Amino acid sequence: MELLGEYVGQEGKPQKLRVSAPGDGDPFQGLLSGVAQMKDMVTELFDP
Amino acid sequence: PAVLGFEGSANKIGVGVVRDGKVLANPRRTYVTPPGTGFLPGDTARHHRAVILDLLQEALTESGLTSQDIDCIAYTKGPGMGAPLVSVAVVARTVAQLWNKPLVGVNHCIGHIEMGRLITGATSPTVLYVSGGNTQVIAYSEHRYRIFGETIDIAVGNCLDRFARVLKISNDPSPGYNIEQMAKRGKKLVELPYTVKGMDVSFSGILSFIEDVAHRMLATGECTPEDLCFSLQETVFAMLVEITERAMAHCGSQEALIVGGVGCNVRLQEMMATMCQERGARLFATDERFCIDNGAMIAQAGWEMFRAGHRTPLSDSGVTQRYRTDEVEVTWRD
Amino acid sequence: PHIFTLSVPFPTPLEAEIAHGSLAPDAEPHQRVVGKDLTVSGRILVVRWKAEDCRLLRISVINFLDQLSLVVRTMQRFGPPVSR
Ligand SMILES: [Mg+2]
């Protein structure tokens, strides 16, 4: 359905990450794509 | 029973299949880094993740066995590098659950010992376990592989590997093997510290000494890199022979078995076999297929463990970077 | 403390349970600095991180996603799970 990450710093300000279908395609292929996309968002969130 | 074994505690990744004393498959890959560099946990775990599933299917296909022909899944619980141990364990745990098979967490040293005992047919030897990660003198007694002697700092293989890095010697097929080939051409014996501590050994001092002797050579050139490979081997192997002999004498052992990556070295084998000859003892040594870390050694120790009633529930399957040889209850021996 | 929560959906509750069974046993390498907790409800795997350091929290989350990707590839290539 949806892969999501929620970061809450020591300040208390919450930052959300999310990756966007159960159709004819392979379910694990879709999940692998989401995980790879989540790695990019986590990198982008923590780098600055 | 047939056991599927997973190994990737250092820079070697392998999947083995063992069935009633027969190795049915043993594919393996080695993570080779540029000369002068050492493999890091992060990059090593990345290499292992990229090839582990290819090795698993290679092992299944070569063995002729399918998922449901496998009776047990064995994997290295430890010791070793953190990131690579976790990557191998997550796969072992997944296939165990998928196929609904039991799981057995194996101690890396017991893997080497059990494979050593299977291949060579050693009855009651004094065991010398030498690699890049370990240096121990072991003897089986009352359901324990007891540590009689060991390195108090770095493993003998770590001393050899780091010396190859300072001389910028190739890591292909292994820094150890290339040190060994260079040592054969050595003509001058350079004196080095001899640091035996009763039944224990030390290699930190020898490595720092030979590092300084190497930097002296690149600047003055009194000797050759071949002389230093020869000299390092003569010192570290004579020290390993001494502590093995001291353990053999204290237990009345008539057999000696060398296991681990450094056990591949024909010069160390020659030196140990000579000490054994003068004592009236036998020297046992495995070949290139099994001296280096491999999945079949894990499947073999796993086979012994599974039959005796050892099981690792998933909740207790967590890997340990420190797992001592004497911490396993050897219930498969009398 | 620095907190990170990850929610991962799986095709079936059994595949979520298998991923939990495979990923949960390992202790974090720097336990005093970064800790994590894994739970599973239905098809959802929930990972909860608590950290003292931001860089080591990023490293832990990235390392986990790489292990999760490997587990997903294992289930795809060597599955489906046999009936039990
Ligand atoms: Mg080894």
Residue numbers in the entry:
A (entry chain D): 1 to 20, 23 to 50
B (entry chain K): 2 to 335
C (entry chain B): 60 to 143
Manuscript excerpt for this entry:
Furthermore, we determine the crystal structure of the GON7/LAGE3/OSGEP KEOPS subcomplex showing that GON7 becomes structured upon binding to LAGE3. We obtained 1.9 Å resolution diffraction data of the GON7/LAGE3/OSGEP complex. LAGE3 is at the center of the complex, binding on one side to OSGEP and on the other to GON7, which does not directly interact with OSGEP. The two helices of LAGE3 associate with the N-terminal helices of OSGEP into a helical bundle. Only 45% of the GON7 sequence adopts a well-defined structure upon binding to LAGE3, confirming our SAXS- and NMR-based conclusions. The N-terminal peptide of GON7 forms a β-hairpin between Met1 and Ser20 and the region between Gly25 and Pro50 forms a helix that lies parallel against the β-hairpin. The β-hairpin of GON7 aligns with the β-sheet of LAGE3 to form a continuous five stranded anti-parallel sheet. The helix of GON7 packs in an anti-parallel orientation against the C-terminal helix of LAGE3. The association mode between GON7 and LAGE3 is very similar to that of the yeast Pcc1/Gon7 complex, illustrated by their superposition (RMSD = 1.4 Å).
